Amino acid sequence: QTSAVQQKLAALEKSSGGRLGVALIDTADNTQVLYRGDERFPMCSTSKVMAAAAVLKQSETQKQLLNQPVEIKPADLVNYSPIAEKHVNGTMTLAELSAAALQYSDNTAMNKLIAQLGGPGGVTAFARAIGDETFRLDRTEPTLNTAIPGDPRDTTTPRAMAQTLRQLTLGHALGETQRAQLVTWLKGNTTGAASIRAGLPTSWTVGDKTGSGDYGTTNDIAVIWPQGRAPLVLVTYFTQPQQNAESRRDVLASAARIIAEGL
């Protein structure tokens, strides 16, 4: 059971020197394309989607939760927090933290989302509650990015993440206003133009969350709205053998382009 698309993804992976994972869901017919779909990959910042969604779920029973202020102290600042660093010795609301984590990949903001959920295990508990048995968040930023090969911490599989991203953005894992808010945030991502988006026709609309970490780990998870047809969900995970390997967003664009050729 190896398709033309899977053979092309294998050829891409062989040329890339790394390990590639892909899961597509076409919501027009619920069909799937999987490449290493059940192998675990380090999530890095793609886990920010699960944390923001878990807070959105909390806000379904607390109408003012997203306006709740959270203190940002100098000691809270973790590498790559361009929004939180403007608010040190001040506050950001949970909505502001969600937007910063999703759209700017603000690490301190992610840590505030994790804390609001009671720790990394609270994010994992939310994943289980929406039917994801695979996702595990074990650490905070920045150590969740160590991406060590063979390490199960802070990993998921492409298959699971694609199914969860569908349920969160297009299904009913969240209330309708909350699903719309998540979609709005993802569509406003600033960090995605070189990843899945770069491999798709420019007329298609994309919301995505990127991730990057050690071992050259380069990830992207996306909901895709092609012109005139039902949306797609696509996840592309990539990781490399050397701890200091460089990012390869072009490999995710290449995977997305192969996927799009098969439609």
Side-chain angles (χ1 to χ4, degrees):
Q1 250 158 341
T2 307
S3 70
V5 169
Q6 288 167 317
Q7 284 166 334
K8 294 178 175 179
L9 291 172
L12 171 59
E13 173 184 68
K14 185 177 177 200
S15 301
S16 77
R19 178 169 65 100
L20 174 69
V22 179
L24 170 72
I25 304 170
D26 186 341
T27 72
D29 56 17
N30 300 324
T31 56
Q32 294 174 47
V33 176
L34 300 145
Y35 187 83
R36 302 195 189 279
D38 301 304
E39 300 188 19
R40 285 186 175 276
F41 290 81
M43 291 183 280
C44 301
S45 284
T46 63
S47 62
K48 286 166 167 70
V49 175
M50 191 77 74
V55 172
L56 282 169
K57 173 55 70 171
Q58 282 182 331
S59 76
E60 295 174 23
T61 51
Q62 291 178 262
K63 183 188 211 314
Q64 320 298 331
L65 182 68
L66 294 182
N67 305 323
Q68 256 188 34
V70 177
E71 297 198 347
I72 317 287
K73 303 290 188 203
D76 304 343
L77 277 190
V78 290
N79 218 34
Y80 303 140
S81 304
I83 309 309
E85 71 181 17
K86 310 200 265 193
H87 298 85
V88 171
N89 293 318
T91 59
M92 297 174 60
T93 67
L94 282 169
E96 281 175 326
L97 290 157
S98 300
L102 286 181
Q103 297 187 331
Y104 297 87
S105 210
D106 193 293
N107 286 331
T108 298
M110 172 59 149
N111 281 354
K112 298 310 186 178
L113 301 181
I114 292 169
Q116 164 63 24
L117 304 163
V123 184
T124 305
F126 172 69
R128 299 290 180 278
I130 65 167
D132 184 334
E133 289 292 318
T134 306
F135 176 102
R136 50 181 295 172
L137 192 70
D138 298 87
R139 295 169 290 177
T140 58
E141 295 282 358
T143 57
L144 63 80
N145 298 294
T146 55
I148 300 163
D151 186 354
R153 294 177 297 175
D154 308 297
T155 60
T156 195
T157 68
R159 183 200 303 264
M161 192 62 47
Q163 176 67 24
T164 298
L165 186 61
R166 189 205 181 154
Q167 293 298 33
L168 289 168
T169 61
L170 308 170
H172 298 289
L174 301 173
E176 173 53 53
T177 71
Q178 289 78 24
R179 177 209 74 81
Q181 177 64 267
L182 179 60
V183 168
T184 294
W185 281 331
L186 292 172
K187 283 180 180 181
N189 183 201
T190 69
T191 75
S195 301
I196 283 167
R197 267 168 222 243
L200 304 181
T202 53
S203 65
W204 297 7
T205 291
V206 178
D208 82 296
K209 176 71 192 91
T210 54
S212 60
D214 289 352
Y215 288 88
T217 296
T218 313
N219 301 330
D220 194 21
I221 68 176
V223 183
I224 301 157
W225 290 268
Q227 268 203 238
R229 54 171 300 167
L232 314 163
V233 177
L234 181 62
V235 300
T236 54
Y237 285 110
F238 185 67
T239 192
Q240 296 180 75
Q242 319 86 348
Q243 194 184 34
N244 67 350
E246 300 255 72
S247 65
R248 294 295 307 268
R249 302 181 290 190
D250 65 293
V251 171
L252 312 179
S254 288
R257 176 171 307 111
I258 286 155
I259 288 294
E261 296 171 3
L263 307 177

